Amino acid sequence: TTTVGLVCKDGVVMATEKRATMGNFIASKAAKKIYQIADRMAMTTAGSVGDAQFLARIIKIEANLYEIRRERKPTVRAIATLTSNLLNSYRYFPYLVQLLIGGIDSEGKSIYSIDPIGGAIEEKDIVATGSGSLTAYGVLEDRFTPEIGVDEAVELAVRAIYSAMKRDSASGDGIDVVKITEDEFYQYSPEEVEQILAKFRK
Amino acid sequence: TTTVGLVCKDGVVMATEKRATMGNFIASKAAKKIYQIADRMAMTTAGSVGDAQFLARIIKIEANLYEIRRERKPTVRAIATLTSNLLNSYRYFPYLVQLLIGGIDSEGKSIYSIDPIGGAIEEKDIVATGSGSLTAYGVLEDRFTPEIGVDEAVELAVRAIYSAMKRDSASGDGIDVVKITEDEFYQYSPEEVEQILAKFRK
Amino acid sequence: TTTVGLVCKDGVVMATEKRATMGNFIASKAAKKIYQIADRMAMTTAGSVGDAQFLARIIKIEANLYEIRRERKPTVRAIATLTSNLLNSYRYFPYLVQLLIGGIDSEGKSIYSIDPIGGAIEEKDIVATGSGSLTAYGVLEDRFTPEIGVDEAVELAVRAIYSAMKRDSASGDGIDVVKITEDEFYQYSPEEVEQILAKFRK
Amino acid sequence: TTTVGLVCKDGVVMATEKRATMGNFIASKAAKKIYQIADRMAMTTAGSVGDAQFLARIIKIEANLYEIRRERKPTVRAIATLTSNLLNSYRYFPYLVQLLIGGIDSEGKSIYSIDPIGGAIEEKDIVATGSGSLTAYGVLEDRFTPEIGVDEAVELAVRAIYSAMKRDSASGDGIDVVKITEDEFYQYSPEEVEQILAKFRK
Amino acid sequence: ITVFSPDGRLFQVEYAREAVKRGATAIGIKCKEGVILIADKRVGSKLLEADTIEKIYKIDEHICAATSGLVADARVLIDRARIEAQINRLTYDEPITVKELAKKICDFKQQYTQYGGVRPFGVSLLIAGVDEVPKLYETDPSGALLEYKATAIGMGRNAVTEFFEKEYRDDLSFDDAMVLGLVAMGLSIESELVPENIEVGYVKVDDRTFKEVSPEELKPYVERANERIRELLKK
Amino acid sequence: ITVFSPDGRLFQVEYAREAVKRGATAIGIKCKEGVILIADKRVGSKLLEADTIEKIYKIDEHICAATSGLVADARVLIDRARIEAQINRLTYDEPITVKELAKKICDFKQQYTQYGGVRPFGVSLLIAGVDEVPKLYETDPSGALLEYKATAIGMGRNAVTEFFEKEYRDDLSFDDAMVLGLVAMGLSIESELVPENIEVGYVKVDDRTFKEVSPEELKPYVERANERIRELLKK
Amino acid sequence: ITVFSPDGRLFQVEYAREAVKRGATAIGIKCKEGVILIADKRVGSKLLEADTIEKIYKIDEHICAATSGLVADARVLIDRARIEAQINRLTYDEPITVKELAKKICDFKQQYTQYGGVRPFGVSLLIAGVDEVPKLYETDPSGALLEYKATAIGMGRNAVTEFFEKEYRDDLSFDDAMVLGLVAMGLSIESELVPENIEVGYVKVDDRTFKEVSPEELKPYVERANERIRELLKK
Amino acid sequence: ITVFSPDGRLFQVEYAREAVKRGATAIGIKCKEGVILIADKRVGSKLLEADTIEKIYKIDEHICAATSGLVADARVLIDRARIEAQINRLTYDEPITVKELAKKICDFKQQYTQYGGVRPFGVSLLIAGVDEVPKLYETDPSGALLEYKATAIGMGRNAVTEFFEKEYRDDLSFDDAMVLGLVAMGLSIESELVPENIEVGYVKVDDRTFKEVSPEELKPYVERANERIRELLKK
Amino acid sequence: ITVFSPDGRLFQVEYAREAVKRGATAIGIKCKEGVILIADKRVGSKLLEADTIEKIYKIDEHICAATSGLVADARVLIDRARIEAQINRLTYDEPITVKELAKKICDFKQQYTQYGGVRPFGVSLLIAGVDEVPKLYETDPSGALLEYKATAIGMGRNAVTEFFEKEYRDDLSFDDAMVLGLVAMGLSIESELVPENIEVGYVKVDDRTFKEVSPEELKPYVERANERIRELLKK
C-alpha cells in the first residue's frame, strides 16, 4: 500500500504498487491499481484492492456517461468530486479506500486526493496515501522542482516507492506507473519499469 | 487541532491549524480546514478533516441557494442555525465535528459554535474549540480588547493558535487565517502568515 | 419448572408447579401456569407465567374462533399445529415458553409438546418438561401403564410432580393439576389437592 | 446426532438416532427423527433438533403441492434442490440443519445432502453427517458393497448408528430407521430396530 | 388525462402552449458580448407594486431565466431549476452548463406530460447564460429545447420574432443588442416603454456572473430605444 | 380534474376564482407607516355571535392574513401557513419574510392544481406584515403571486379596487390609511359599517408586532369613516 | 367526484347539505349559565326502541355533540371527535377547548372534500361545551365552522333559526333557555313532544361536566313547554 | 389511457405512430464498411441556431441513434438508452450490442404502452451501430424492432423507402453510401442540402468508434449529392 | 378497463384476439419423433435485413416458441417465458415442462386482464418442446392453454387448421411432418415458399436439443413443399 502522485509542468505522473496482501496470503500481484477513467485521466488507489477496481468501473461508467451526455469530456475536478459524493453516500458499504484521481483537463493538470469518507482537496502539488507513503513522499519532495519533465517524473515516482519497498515487501515488488501527457496515456507494465529500477539496481 | 475565532470591532478574524494527519503523517501540501460558505462567511473545523470538507460544501450550496431564493443575502445566524438542524437531521450518518461558522453580514459581526449534537450558540467576541482550546483561550483573552483593529487582530489569532502547536507532538506546521474586513474575504494562506509569526520567533 | 402430562385410557391429566422458578422473589399466589384453551383442552407451560398467559389468551381465542367458523370442535392436533406456526413466526420476539397442549376430542386424546423453534411432537403417552423434566419423568415411568385410571393418574401425577417440586419452596405450596375426562374440565384448586399430598408430606 | 443414508440396488435405507432434546433435556423419547416428505421419500437430519421439525412440514407441504400442480410426483433432485433454495430464502433468520433428503423415483435412487448456507450435493452411495459421522462412516466403509440388498442394508445402517451413538455425548435414545423399497415406505419403529441390536450386544 | 390525438399531438401540450400565449411577453437577445434577457412586468393598475415583481428569476449564479405563461407553474419550475443547478455544484464542483440545466428542467416537464395523474406545466422559460460562450434557450411546455440567438415567448412572440428576422444580426455590440431588445418589447406592447414597467437582467461574458439592471442604468437604454419605437409605430 | 381549455386556462383555476368572488370581503391597505388588514364578518343571522368570529388570522408575530372563498379551504391553508412560518424559525432562527411565506403556500397551491388527485384550494389570502418594510401581497387560487399595496379580495373586489384607484395616495399617515380602508369596505356593502361586524388587525412598522384591533380601540376610526361612507354613497 | 362548478361551489358539498336537511334535526341554545343541546331522536316505528338510541353523544367530559345528516357518516365523525378530544389530554394534559375540537374535525372533513378518491362526510354536528365560558358551534359538511348563540341543523334549521330570531334573547335563565329550546323543537315538528322521544343533555358552568337529562328529569320541562307549543300553533 | 381498439389495434400506439409521421425525417444507410445516420435539423427560423441543435445522439462509443417524433420523448428515451448501455458495460465489461440495446429501450416503450398509468413514448428512433458488424435498427413507438439496410422515420419515410427500392445496393461502398443518404435527404425536403441543415454521424467498422462528420467534412459529400438531387428533381 | 360484456366475454380480450389474427402467422406440427415450429419471417421491402428477423425464439434447451400478434407484447412475454423457464431450473434443477411453461405465462397473462388498470396481452404463442413426450400448446390472449396436435395462429388461423383436418395423418415421420407444415404455411400466404421468408426451428425427442434450421438444411424440405403448394394453388 502506497500511492504517490506528482503534478509536473508537462503532465501528470502517478505511481502505485501492484502488491497488497490480506494476511500473509497474496490477494494480487498481477492487478493494476491505476486505472484509466476517461481519455487522459487516471485513478490510483491506496487501501484494499477489490473495492478499488469495482469502484473505478462505476466512476469510469459515470465518466463515459458525462462525455456522451453533456457533449464535453469531464474535468478531473468533476470526477474527483463525483467520487467523493459517492463514497460519502456509500458509508454503509465497503468502499473505504483513499484514492487519488488525477489527469489532464481543459484547466491544465491536476490530481485530487479524495478523503475515504468523501471530500476532495485540490492539489497542483504532490500526494501519498498508504503505509509506504511516510518515506516516499520525503524522497519525492527532494528531487521534485516545479520545472520538471515527465521523463524524469517516472524515475522519481519509482524511486519513491523503492523507499517505501525497504519497509516490507508489501509495498513494491511490482510497481505500476502512468504517464499522462494529454496525447499519450501510457501504462508501462512491469517489464519497462523493471529497467527504470535497473538503473537503481533494485 | 484547534480553532480560534474572534469578533473584532470592524470585522472577524479566525484561524485554525492546517495540520491534517493520518497517524502523524502529512499526505499533501494543502488541506484547508477553512471554507468560505458565503461571500463573507467562513467555516473552521476542529475535529475530522474529510467529514468537514464534504459537509462544508453542502452548507455552502445552501448559502448560495438561500441568496438566489429569498433575494436577500443570508445573515450569520441563518447559515449557523441551518447547519445545526442539518447535523441533527443527519445524525444517522454523523459527521463528528465541532465547527465555528462566523463572519459578516449587513447586521454586523458574530461567530456561532455548532455541535453535531446540535444547537448553535453565539460567542460574544472570543471562542476557542478543539483539544488545544484550553491553551488557546489563555493567549487570546489576555491581549484581546473589545476595541481591536482587524490588523491588530491577525497578529493575535496566529499567536493564539501557535501556543497549542508547539505543545502537541502531532502538530507544528500549517496555519489557516481569514481576515474578513467587510470588503474582502482574504484568505492569507501559508506564505503571508509566515512573516506574521517571525515576530514571535519560536 | 416441572411439568408432567400423561394420556390415560379414560382421561388425560397434567400437572405443573404453581409458580415457575423466578428466584427468591414471588409476585402473586393466584398465579397459574395452567390455562384452559378449549372446553376439554388445556395448556401447561414450562417457562414464564407472563409469557405463558399472554400467548395462551391468543390461542384460546383462535380456538374459539376455529370452533365457530367451521362448526366443528377443534381437535388437539389442530391447536398444537396452530400454536407451532405462532411460535416460529415469533422466534425473534420473546416467547421461549415451551408448551404442552393436550386434552380431549372426537379423534381421541393426546398431549403435544410445542417448541419456540417450531414443529409439534405428538407424545404418545408420557411427557415432562422443564429442569425437573428428568426427575419427574422417572417417577411417572415407574407406575405408568396404558390402562391407568383417571384417579390413579391424578394420584400418580401429584406424587410425580411433587418430587421435582421439592427443589423450590416458594412454588411447593399449591399445585396445578387438571382432569380432562370429556365431562369435566376440572381444575382442582389448591385446597382439594393439598389433602392428597399431605400423605407424601410437606 | 448422527445420520446415515445408504443407496442400494433395491432401495434406499437411512437411519438416525432418536435423541431429540429441547433446551438440552430429553423430555421424552416419544419422538421421531425421520420425516416423510413424499410417498417414497424421507428426510433425516443431522444438526440441531429444533430446526428439523417444522422444516419437514414445509418441504413436505410443498411436495404434495408439486404432485398436485404438475400431475406428477417430484423427482429426488427437485425436492432436494427446493430445500436448498428454501434454506437460502429465510437465511435472515437462518435454520442450521444438514438434511439428507432422499428416496425413490423413476430415475432410480439417490440421497442428497443439503447444507444450511447453500447448495445440495448428490451423494453417490454413501452419506453420513453429524457429530457421529466419523464412527458411523467408519462402519460403512468396511462392509458396504455396491450390490448391497435392502434387508442387508438395514442391518448395516443400524450398526453404523449403534456404534456412533455410544461414543458421543449427544446421541442415543434408540435408533430410527427407514426402508424405501418403492413397494413399501416402511418405518421400522422402536419395537423392531431394538431386535437388530439384540443380535449384537444386548 | 394526457393522451394522443388522432393527429398524434398531445391535446394537453397544445392547450398548455395557448396557456403560454395568454401569459406576458419576454424576450432575449444575444450577442457575442453577453446575453440580454428582458421580461415585461404586468402593470394593470397603479395598486400593483412594480419594484418587487419577479419576471426575471435568477437560477444559478451565471444563469437567469425569464418566464411567460402561468406564473404559479413557472415559479415552481424555476425553484426546481435552482435546486438542480446547485445539485450540479454539489456532485461535480462546477456550474451547470446553460444547456445542461435546460435539459434537466425539461425532464421535469416531459415526465408530467407523459403521466396521466398530472398535467403539463403551462409555462415556457427562456434560460440564458454564459458557460464559456453566450447561450439562450427557449423551452416549451412539451419539454422541447431550442437554442436561439434571439427569441421571444408570450403574447409578443409573433411580433418580436418577425421583427428579429429583419433587425437581428449575428454579431452585435452589447450596447446595440440591449437597445434592440427594448425596441422589440416596445413594438409588441405597441407603446413607448417606461423604465419601471419592464424588467432587464444580463449575463455578460466579462463578468460570468448574473447581474441585473438597476432602474437608473436601464434609464438611458429606454430613452435611446424610445426614439426607434416611435418610428416603427408610424410605419 | 384539472386540465387546460382550448383557450389555455385551467378550468379549476378559473372556477376557484368564482368561489373567491362568492366570499366575504377583505381588504388590505398599506402605507409607509405599516400595513392594515380589514375583513367583513357579516350577517349571519342575529343568532350568529359575530364578535368571536375570526377572519383575520395571525400567522406570525409580525404577519397576519385575511381571506375570502371557501372557509374550510381557507382555515386549512392558514394552518399550513402558520406551520411554514414556524418551520423557517426552526431552521434558520429568523422570522419568515412576507414574500417567502406567501411564496411557500403558493407552491403548495400549485401542487394541488397540477395533480389530478385533488381539486384546487379555493382561497385568496392576503399576506401582510412588516418584515423589513411594509409589504402586502395578495395570493390567488392557482398560486398567482402579485404584490399590491392596496387591494381587495372577495365579493367587494371590483368596487373597492376602483375606490383605491383614484383615492390611494402613497404618502399616508397610519390613521389616514385606516380611515381610507374602512371607507372602501362601506361602499361595497352600500351602507355604514358596525365596528363589531368588521375586524381589523394590523402589523405596524414601529412595533413590528401584530395587534388585533378590538371594538373599543377601533371606535374613533369607525366614527371618522361612517362620516365619509355616508357622504360618498350620496354621490 | 368533487369538482368546482362555474358557480364557484363544490357541488358535492352542496349535495351534502341537502343530505343534512333530510336527517333528523338537533338544536342548541346557549345561555349565561351553560349550554344545552337538544336532539330529536324521534322514531318512526313502534318496534324501534327509543329507550336506547343516541342523538346526543358525549365527546369529552366538557363537550357534547349532536348531529344531523347521515347517521353512518355522523357516527364515524363523532368517534373521530371522541378520539380527538382524548388526543389533546395525551399531549398537553389539558381538556381541549370547544373551538379547537370543532376546528380539528372540520380540518378532517375538509381533507375528504379535497381528496379525490373519497367523498365529503354528509353531516353537520352541533358541538356545545363549556370550556371556560359557554360555546356552541355549528359545523357544516363543507368544513365550515361558525359559533352560534342558538341554532339548528337538519329539517328544523330554517324554521327554528327563524323562530329564535324573534324569541331568543341574549341572556336567559337556564330553566327558561330549556323551555325555549323544547318549544322550538315542538314548533319544528308541529306537534307536542313526549319525554320518551327527545334527548336533552348539557354541559353546565358550575358542574363543568356533562350529564344527560334522564327521561324522568326531562319530564317537567316538556310539560311546561307543551302549553306554549299549543299557544304558538293557536297563534 | 391505453386499451384495445375494436379493430384489434391500440389507439394510443396508432396515434403515436402518427406522431412520428408528423416529426422531422431522419434516415440511415448501412453499407459493409459502416452505418451512416444522417438527420434533418432543417430549421424553421434564422434565429434558430442550426449549429448547436442536436438530432443525432451518441449512445455509446460505437452506437449513435437518430430520432423523429416528439423532441421531448426522444431526448428522455435516448437518455434511458445511454444509461442502459453503460449499465450493460458495467455489469459485463462488454460494450452493449445494437440489437440488444434496442431491445431494452423497446421494452421501455412497451412498458409505457402496456400499462395504463402513463401514455406511450411518441418517437421512432433509428439505432445505428456496429456491434461487430454494421447493424441498423428501426424502433417504433409500440416497442417494435426491425432490422433494415436502409430506412427512414418521419416526414420523408414515404419518399426515402421508395428511393432505396430504386437505388441501393449491398456492395455499395462507403463514399457512395454517404452520398446516397444525403441525396435521399434532399428528396425529402424537395431542395438541395445545406451543410448547416443536416447532422451526420457514422460508426465506422475500421475505427469501431463513432466519430461525427464535421461541417467541414459534410461539404465534399453535399457537393456530389447536389449534382444527383438537382438531376432527379428537375425531371 | 377490462369489464364484462352482457355476453360473458371480456371485450379487451376479444379485441386482443383480433390483434392476434392480424399478426404474422406461425404454426407448429407435432409427430412422435419431435415437434416442429415454423414462423413466417414477414418482409414488406427488399430493405429489410430479413436474415436477422426473429420469429422463433428459443426459450430453453428444449423449448421454443413462435408468436403471432402484437410484436412489442410478444417479446416481453417471451423474455418473461425465458426467465420463468430458468427459474424452474434454478429452484428444482429439472427442466420446466412444456405444459407448465405454458401455464405460468398464461397465469401472468390473466393478471393483465384481471386488473382494469392495465391492458391485456395481445399475443398468442405456440410453445412447443419435449418434456418427455413431444408437446405443442396454443396460448390465448386471455391466458389459457390448449394442447394441439398441429395448429396455427395469425392470418393462416383458419387456412392452416382447415388444411390439417384433411391432410394430417397422426402418425407421421419427421421428414413428412416438416414438409407438411411447410405446405400449410405456403398456403397461408398463398404463394410458393423460399427459405428466407420462413424461420424454422425444432426440438427432437432423440436429442432434446433445440436447433434452428439454417436455410442450407431448410432448402430441401422447401423444395418438396413447393411441389405440393403449387399443386394445390392450381386446382
UniProtKB/Swiss-Prot annotation, chains A, B, C, D:
The UniProt record lists the keyword Protease: yes
Gene3D superfamilies in the record: Glutamine Phosphoribosylpyrophosphate, subunit 1, domain 1 (3.60.20.10)
Enzyme class per UniProt: hydrolase
GO CC, alphabetical: cytoplasm; proteasome core complex, beta-subunit complex
PROSITE patterns: PROTEASOME_BETA_1, PROTEASOME_BETA_2
Regulation: The formation of the proteasomal ATPase PAN-20S proteasome complex, via the docking of the C-termini of PAN into the intersubunit pockets in the alpha-rings, triggers opening of the gate for substrate entry. Interconversion between the open-gate and close-gate conformations leads to a dynamic regulation of the 20S proteasome proteolysis activity.
Record keywords, A-Z: Autocatalytic cleavage, Cytoplasm, Hydrolase, Protease, Proteasome, Threonine protease, Zymogen
Catalytic activity: Cleavage of peptide bonds with very broad specificity
Keyword Ligase applies: no
Main location: cytoplasm
Active-site feature positions: 1 (nucleophile)
Family, per entry: Belongs to the peptidase T1B family.
Job of this protein: Component of the proteasome core, a large protease complex with broad specificity involved in protein degradation.
Designated name of the protein: Proteasome subunit beta
Gene label: psmB
UniProtKB/Swiss-Prot annotation, chains E, F, G, H, I:
Keyword field: Cytoplasm, Proteasome
Gene Ontology BP annotations: proteasomal protein catabolic process; ubiquitin-dependent protein catabolic process
Matches recorded under SUPFAM superfamilies: N-terminal nucleophile aminohydrolases (Ntn hydrolases)
Main localization category: cytoplasm
Record-linked Pfam families: Proteasome (PF00227), Proteasome_A_N (PF10584)
Molecular function GO terms recorded: threonine-type endopeptidase activity
Keyword 4Fe-4S: no
Protein's UniProt keywords contain Cytoplasm: yes
Function, as annotated: Component of the proteasome core, a large protease complex with broad specificity involved in protein degradation.
Name of the protein in its database record: Proteasome subunit alpha
Species whose genome carries this gene: Archaeoglobus fulgidus (strain ATCC 49558 / DSM 4304 / JCM 9628 / NBRC 100126 / VC-16)
